[PDB]
Amino acid sequence: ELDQLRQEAEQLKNQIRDARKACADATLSQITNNIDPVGRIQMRTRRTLRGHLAKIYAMHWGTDSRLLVSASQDGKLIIWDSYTTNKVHAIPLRSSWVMTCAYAPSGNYVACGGLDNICSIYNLKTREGNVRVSRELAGHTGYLSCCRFLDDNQIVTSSGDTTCALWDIETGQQTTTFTGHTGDVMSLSLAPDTRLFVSGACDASAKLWDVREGMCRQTFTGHESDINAICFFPNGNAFATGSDDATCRLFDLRADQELMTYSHDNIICGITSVSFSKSGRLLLAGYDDFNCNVWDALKADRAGVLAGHDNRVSCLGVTDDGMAVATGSWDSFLKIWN
Amino acid sequence: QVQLQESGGGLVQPGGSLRLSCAASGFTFSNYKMNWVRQAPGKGLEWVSDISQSGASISYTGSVKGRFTISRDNAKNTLYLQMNSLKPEDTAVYYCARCPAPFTRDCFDVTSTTYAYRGQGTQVTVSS
Amino acid sequence: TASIAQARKLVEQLKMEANIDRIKVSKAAADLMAYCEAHAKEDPLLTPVPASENPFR
Amino acid sequence: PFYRCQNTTSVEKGNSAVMGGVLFSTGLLGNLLALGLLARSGLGPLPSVFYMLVCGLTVTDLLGKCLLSPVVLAAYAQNRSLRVLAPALDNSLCQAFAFFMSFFGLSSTLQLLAMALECWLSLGHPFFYRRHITLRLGALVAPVVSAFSLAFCALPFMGFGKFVQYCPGTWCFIQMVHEEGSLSVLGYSVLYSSLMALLVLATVLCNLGAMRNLYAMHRRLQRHPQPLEELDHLLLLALMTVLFTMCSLPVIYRAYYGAFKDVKEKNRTSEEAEDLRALRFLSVISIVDPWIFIIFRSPVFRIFF
Amino acid sequence: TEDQRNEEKAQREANKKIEKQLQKDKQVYRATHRLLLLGAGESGKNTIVKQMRITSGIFETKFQVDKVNFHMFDVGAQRDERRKWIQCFNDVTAIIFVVASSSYNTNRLQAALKLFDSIWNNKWLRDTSVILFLNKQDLLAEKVLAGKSKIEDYFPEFARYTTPEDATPEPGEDPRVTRAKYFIRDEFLRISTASGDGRHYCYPHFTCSVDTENIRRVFNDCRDIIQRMHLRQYEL
Ligand SMILES: CC(C)CCC[C@@H](C)[C@H]1CC[C@H]2[C@@H]3CC=C4C[C@@H](O)CC[C@]4(C)[C@H]3CC[C@]12C
Ligand SMILES: CC(C)CCC[C@@H](C)[C@H]1CC[C@H]2[C@@H]3CC=C4C[C@@H](O)CC[C@]4(C)[C@H]3CC[C@]12C
Ligand SMILES: CCCCC[C@H](O)/C=C/[C@H]1C(=O)C[C@H](O)[C@@H]1C/C=C/CCCC(=O)O
């Protein structure tokens, strides 16, 4: 009987591939060939943040574009001032091997987690003035890979259990469970409207999820290896994913297929982080070669290189306003570029 | 999408010979290391053999050395496993396992849980 | 049960995803180019932001 | 007068300034190569305690050769001793030259002892090194050593110790002899000699401990449990210790001899010749340190060597 | 803007306090030596953790040896896909790899060998030493002395293997037990020496689940690793 299900799945996949091919009347590169190239932008480190002990693994810019949160595996979650480089808070983490961090839009709460399988919440604006654990989300059965705040009460978290979950910070329970991924989820990305989120699960495929409906709305299979990074396009209609194959691929929720690929022969190392600028014309992706290459979202060319780090690049994020970009690396130093 | 289609397996008597074939697709067959794993009836996954990207370094398990021959041809993205002499204990579903990442030699495809880069496998049985 | 339940869920999800409202790629590329050229000047990274306005001086 | 050319303004022509020119040029070239390799490393490796210690040591050695060699050679050449070589407000340049000489010697000895102790603590007491020793400590080691050397060599100007000119007339040093026996003039000399001997013995003991730890590591590596392993560090440390001892023992021996091994000095010529040699050998430490500590370790040199 | 300058001074004071706190944290950290414990499911690693300690995805085991803090971390309750989260332990002092030598037939010894090879070849682990604890030696002795579990049936190269000259057999141990032990050791030695060396070293130690000397063995391995890491300093 399993052969019938296998043949049915094969025919469904073939029909979906034929449909995607029929919708591919043209290619984004052939149409953008007329777009003016960005050329070259010599970005320099305007601010250097020091104080982290162990290798930094995660980072997330704040909506205010002033404060930033970075998580290191030394058991500390430091908040830095983008303009003055002054550390605002020094939150010691109960779990040393922290692998994710999230800064709430309002800045009243902060989340983080890792191998402990617990996404602890921290309140930065307590009446006492100190930062204390607000909620512990210990329902996951795997290491927390990435987390992003939907609001002051809702937060999406990725775990090594190959399933994402929507959490209610007030009650501390899984509001909705997202199943369907084959491998361990690595990164998360919230749409501008906070209604959809995508993620890779070490299966060379990205899935579109609905926060309210709680189902895999769409699925992409453009990559060829494990996906470690994902970020939505500023418009919310497309997203780019970073994989160990050393290639970045742009996917559109409406096209349901890969639009273009960003890669180079000399670039053979894996990808760790990917992010878009305010306009989305620049695709800043971190690579394991100790430098971050800026790829033109339209021309598929390297518009710049950020070789200021001495160790592997782990996280990368651009401010909502797009003023400056900070690149995290295992060297325990955060460099802000502009 | 990564796709692996194993073939060449079937029934055989003790001392026979089979030549399994796996049709690779959806990736650069030459940039990834190929590994053969089997799951005996009522048992866990067992590593059989591997073959490097260029095909120079080859290794087999002690129960397979000098009995099976692995081979690959990147010119068509296909893997092979020549079985010279089988025995009843060799009955198992042979799955084709690919390296997690390219340009690497550290494999973690023996995972018991569902591996995202393995084929459906081919059923091979040996009986007198 | 689990072996067949996984396949059943996969088939159901694939059926649900097959009937989506797929859009052409030309229109998506045109919309992306329009969005890029619209907020081009509003991107401090794409265009050279003045030194005075830059808080990172 | 024991010091034949003390109040003198001559230089027994019977002495050719070749032995100083070579000692100056070789050391200058060595220190220049060392600093060039260090600058190449800093422009691109990462900083470390040993790196900063070696940097301080080589910079101090270069700053010495400069001042001193320049004055001596000036003299020999021009043909006027230091007491008249600055024919000006300068019965000076004879006490200042000896002050700088003693300061640089004591500072080189102290920095060598500090590096030996750091290596010994790192290789024999790894936990203690990881716990207490950091780059902030190595950064302050050299300034503190220089300050201590200055404070110690400033004593002859407070009535405890004197500086006198020797036979060649082109250089000066602590009054190792003792005129008639003023525990005040002889006190500073004997104290400097004792301090130098103690520092040399401590450095030798630290080098022996480091070599023992390296030999133990080599024995453990013989079994399974571009760069070079401890086997080359063993030879490097052995050569360094041997040369340092052979260059530091003569001056201490001569100091003790002029201090207590005499009642009325005899054979002034031999005493002066031996006093000159002693420092001739002691000056070789500054030429040996840069090579052994950087050049023999630099991969660029090991490729051909 | 006097208020702006006052807020800047307050933030500078807070930053100075946080810098003092971070200096204290670094002093406490560099004095601590983190260790990763890994091994097959059938290995006796649980007994080792129990002896050393006498829902969460990771367990912390703190033990002191000669006034030296050691933080051994167990990564239990985690999926067997280790290719991702194993990278987080790149800076650990050592990786305590516990393998059951008597677990050879499926053939768990082959799986342990492949896991050790992958750990040794992992790019992000080429600078991390692995402490190989060949656990369950009594079971291997009982199986090879009075048993029909011929190693040549699952390791044809064993038929031609012979006890090396450097072998230090235990007083009273049967020659066959020592031969099997040293063959299983060389099985990992080949992988650890031919795949690369110089950046990290393997410390094979024949131990048992109840052996209390495992703590001293880990202490000696940490000493050796820290010494060999300090030796790198002397390279300009
Ligand atoms: C930590 C390392 C890399 C930096 C410090 C090394 C160098 C640059 C510094 C530290 C202390 C310095 C010495 C301090 C005292 C004196 C006294 C005087 O007679 C001339 C300068 C001299 C001789 C200095 C030479 C340069 C010196 C040795
Ligand atoms: C004393 C330390 C801290 C500072 C070192 C600076 C050097 C350049 C200074 C300090 C004191 C100085 C000495 C003090 C007084 C005299 C006068 C006369 O008798 C000859 C020179 C001599 C002996 C000076 C030579 C230069 C000198 C040695
Ligand atoms: C001297 C002990 C500390 C070392 C300080 C410095 O490095 C020494 C440099 C020496 C040279 O290189 C040339 C010259 O020898 C100079 C110092 C003079 C020593 C005795 C005079 C030699 C002579 O009259 O011919």
GROMACS .gro file of C-alpha atoms and ligand atoms in nm, chain D residues 92 95-96 99-100 150 154 157, ligand 2:
model
   36
  615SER     CA    1   7.949   6.478   3.228
  618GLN     CA    2   7.878   5.924   3.473
  619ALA     CA    3   7.578   5.935   3.238
  622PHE     CA    4   7.450   5.507   3.430
  623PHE     CA    5   7.288   5.417   3.097
  673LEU     CA    6   6.638   5.353   3.683
  677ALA     CA    7   7.030   5.643   4.025
  680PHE     CA    8   7.429   6.017   4.240
 1066LIG     C1    9   6.745   5.935   3.798
 1066LIG     C2   10   6.652   5.879   3.690
 1066LIG     C3   11   6.514   5.852   3.748
 1066LIG     C4   12   6.644   5.970   3.566
 1066LIG     C5   13   6.754   5.937   3.464
 1066LIG     C6   14   6.788   6.051   3.368
 1066LIG     C7   15   6.938   6.080   3.348
 1066LIG     C8   16   6.953   6.127   3.204
 1066LIG     C9   17   7.002   6.184   3.445
 1066LIG    C10   18   6.940   6.185   3.586
 1066LIG    C11   19   7.040   6.248   3.679
 1066LIG    C12   20   7.156   6.286   3.589
 1066LIG    C13   21   7.290   6.303   3.660
 1066LIG    C14   22   7.283   6.394   3.783
 1066LIG    C15   23   7.402   6.484   3.801
 1066LIG    C16   24   7.513   6.476   3.725
 1066LIG    C17   25   7.612   6.589   3.734
 1066LIG    C18   26   7.753   6.537   3.723
 1066LIG     O1   27   7.776   6.457   3.840
 1066LIG    C19   28   7.772   6.460   3.592
 1066LIG    C20   29   7.644   6.404   3.531
 1066LIG    C21   30   7.533   6.364   3.627
 1066LIG    C22   31   7.578   6.236   3.700
 1066LIG    C23   32   7.395   6.353   3.559
 1066LIG    C24   33   7.390   6.277   3.425
 1066LIG    C25   34   7.250   6.247   3.371
 1066LIG    C26   35   7.155   6.186   3.473
 1066LIG    C27   36   7.206   6.042   3.501
   0.00000   0.00000   0.00000
